[PDB]
């Protein structure tokens, strides 16, 4: 029989209509720029840390590495910690996890520079054996 229901328009994106009250301009452009200049700024520093050692490099290795790794694990986390597969709230936790990671990174480095041998001497001593 042809005695059955009325159906609706199939799910379909209408790029004008949905465009209406959804005009926002909050650009990640200017951030992505810097974190590449920052990575490019780090270029000369890595080989410098092979040559010039001691207690002051140790501090800006820690410094600049913390901040790079911060913008870094944040992108790796958006990727593998998506809410589709973790549920909405366990996923927000992984976002917040990110900060905790960036922040324990520094604490831990700072500490190691301040109480143990420092990054650069650490390198030396493993390379001595």
């Amino acid at each position: 029989t042809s005695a059955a229901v009325t159906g609706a328009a199939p799910p379909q994106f209408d790029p004008i209509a949905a465009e209406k009250g959804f005009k926002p301009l909050h650009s990640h452009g200017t951030l992505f720029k810097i974190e590449r200049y920052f990575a490019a700024a780090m270029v000369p520093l890595i080989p410098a840390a092979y040559f010039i050692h001691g207690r002051e490099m140790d501090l800006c290795l820690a410094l600049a590495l913390t901040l790079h790794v911060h913008w870094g694990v944040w992108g790796v986390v958006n990727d593998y910690g998506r809410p589709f597969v973790l549920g909405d709230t366990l996923a927000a936790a992984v976002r917040v996890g990110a900060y905790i990671f960036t922040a324990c990174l520094l604490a831990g480095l700072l500490y190691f520079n301040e109480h143990d041998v420092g990054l650069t001497r650490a390198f030396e001593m493993v390379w001595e054996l």
Partner: protein, 613 residues
């Protein structure tokens, strides 16, 4: 089994998402109708996207040109089977239509002055035939159907048409001769959708797959013509299958006529430019009906090229490296993939291929589907329109013009929306559906779906493709043809012994392809019998046993002092094939070729002449 039915209501529905279809969709959309587009595939996958050489319009971007010469060249190529009003409409509105496309985004190749580039093509000329070789063919290099289609598909997203993608059209909805919608299958989930509308537009494209070898998509099964036949409409001129001169020999991919109108030519196994012989004037730029027979003779008579001496060579290698790459990049690559050929160094193996269907659902200049009686003129079919290749307004007579089909789609699509906007008053409410609405359409599906016979869909189709090819070939003869009509009509019997396997509803390839074999047969039978009963030779139709063109007068002599042969004795007439789907029985009838132009004041009707290129 049992089926779930979904009713929708729209002002206008379009079956087809190709060139034509999408232009109707967007035109009606922009002029504010609630438009549903039904299509068995994603619009971009439609056959229009395969198109190559480009689109004719008298922009005269390359040299001065008058739109009237194009009308001239059109009326000629149609071997006066074309309706001079339709060819009037087509060629006037071409300049606008193509300019629109430029405006819509379509990125045509460019002249130094920065207007649309144009190449020369198969069978066109300046000055009502006298002048030169025309340069009217506008193009996105090599890949114009593609780029055109995309531009249209993108543009149709700006006009809120509601897209029913991968839904297979089963039948038109008929209420006592009026068209009230379509019934389609929705592949993604099994559901059956009746669409109610004020207007339907059948814009479903050709039926190449009827032949064992063609340039067309796997997706050209003439489902629309099947839908017409099936709703009691007779189809016209089915016998005029365009054979394109140059399909790659093995597979039958198409090497565009552009490659010719850019410089390239045909060669036989004697290394002779034999097209100088068959067409002294036009040479390799003769009309495809001619150029093709020309190739097919050279074969028949031992000048065939290759291992078996059975194709010819298209040669472009003489042309500059740069021009080949900027003017024909997409064939360079497909010549290489399919026929191992580097087109700067060797020739492409080519052989005529079934290519285009001038035939289709009859329609007046307005693109409104029509039934026709001898006594009471031609009756409009209310609610129904048809356009693009599935239609027959016959802008093409007996032989299509190169680069006029992308036009005939674009233009008459546009002519659908324009003609509906005009006459669809916002009072006439969406038709209701009648009781039983499209029941025997789901009843077919069901029996085809559970079809238990002992001939698999795959086999029936093959022998219909393989037979249609031997009997309704390039050159035809009555004793092979009538032989053919016999085999064919045994095949419409074998449909009762049809076996399928995939018994499911959610995406059934086996099932849709069987629906398509059903549709193909109706297309093929009608084709072959009309082909058989036409005792003449006009356009693409070539009887070896009635080699002459049979008109009312003999246009070889001076005319002054001759009697008009009566309608029934000459052949200058459209061929209407009525079929009963149930039984497969065809009866013929004939319809007069409209000679009047649209404005006897705007442009002068072109009386028949002898067709020499």
């Amino acid at each position: 089994a049992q089926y779930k039915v979904i009713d929708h209501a729209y002002d206008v529905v379009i079956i087809g998402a190709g060139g034509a279809g999408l232009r109707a969709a967007m035109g009606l959309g922009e002029a504010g109708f609630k438009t549903a587009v039904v299509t068995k595939m994603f619009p971009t996958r439609s056959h229009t996207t395969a198109a190559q050489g480009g689109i004719n319009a008298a922009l005269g971007s390359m040299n001065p040109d008058d739109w009237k010469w194009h009308f001239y060249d059109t009326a000629k190529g149609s071997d006066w089977l074309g309706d001079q009003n339709a060819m009037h409409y087509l060629t006037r509105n071409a300049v606008e239509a193509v300019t629109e496309l430029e405006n819509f985004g379509m990125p045509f190749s460019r002249t130094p002055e920065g207007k649309i580039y144009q190449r020369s093509f198969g069978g066109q000329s300046n000055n009502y035939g006298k002048g030169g070789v025309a340069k009217r063919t506008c193009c996105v290099a090599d890949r114009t159907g593609h780029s055109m289609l995309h531009t249209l598909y993108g543009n149709s997203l700006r006009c809120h048409c509601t897209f029913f993608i991968e839904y297979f059209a089963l039948d038109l909805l008929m209420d006592k001769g009026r068209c009230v919608g379509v019934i389609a299958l929705c592949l993604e989930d099994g559901t059956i959708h009746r669409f109610r509308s004020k207007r339907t537009i059948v814009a479903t494209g050709g039926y190449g797959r009827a032949y064992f070898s063609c340039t067309t998509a796997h997706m050209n099964t003439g489902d629309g013509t099947a839908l017409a036949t099936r709703a009691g409409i007779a189809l016209e001129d089915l016998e005029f299958i365009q054979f394109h001169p140059t399909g790659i020999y093995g597979v039958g991919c198409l090497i565009t006529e552009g490659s010719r109108g850019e410089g390239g030519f045909l060669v036989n196994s004697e290394g002779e430019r034999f097209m100088e012989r068959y067409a002294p004037k036009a040479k390799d730029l003769a009309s495809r009906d001619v150029v093709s027979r020309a190739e097919t003779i050279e074969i028949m008579e031992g000048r065939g090229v290759g291992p078996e001496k059975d194709h010819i060579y298209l040669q472009l290698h003489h042309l500059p490296a740069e021009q080949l790459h900027q003017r024909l990049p997409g064939i360079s690559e497909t010549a290489k993939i399919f026929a191992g050929v580097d087109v700067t160094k060797e020739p492409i193996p080519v052989i005529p291929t079934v290519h285009y269907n001038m035939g289709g659902i009859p329609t007046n200049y307005k693109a409104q589907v029509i039934k026709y009686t001898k006594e009471g003129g031609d009756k409009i079919v209310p609610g129904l329109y048809a356009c693009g290749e599935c239609a027959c307004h016959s802008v093409h007579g007996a032989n299509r013009l190169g680069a006029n089909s992308l036009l005939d789609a674009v233009v008459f699509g546009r002519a659908c929306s324009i003609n509906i906007k005009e006459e669809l008053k916002p009072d006439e409410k969406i038709p209701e559906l009648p009781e039983g609405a499209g029941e025997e359409s789901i009843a077919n599906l069901d029996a085809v779906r559970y079809a238990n016979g002992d001939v698999p869909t795959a086999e029936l189709r093959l022998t219909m493709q393989k037979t249609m090819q031997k009997h309704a070939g390039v050159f035809r003869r009555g004793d092979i043809l009538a032989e053919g009509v016999k085999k064919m009509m045994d095949l419409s019997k074998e449909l009762k012994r049809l076996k399928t396997t995939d018994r499911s509803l959610i995406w059934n390839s086996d099932l849709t392809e069987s629906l398509e074999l059903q549709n193909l047969m109706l297309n093929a039978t009608q084709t072959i019998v009309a082909a058989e009963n036409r005792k003449e030779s006009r356009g693409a139709h070539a009887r070896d046993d009635f080699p002459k063109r049979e008109d009312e007068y003999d246009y070889s002599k001076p005319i002054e002092g001759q009697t008009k042969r009566p309608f029934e004795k000459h052949w200058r007439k459209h061929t209407l094939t009525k079929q009963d789907p149930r039984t497969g029985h065809i009866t013929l009838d004939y319809r007069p070729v409209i000679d009047k132009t649209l404005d006897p004041a705007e442009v002068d009707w072109i009386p028949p002449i002898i067709r020499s290129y």
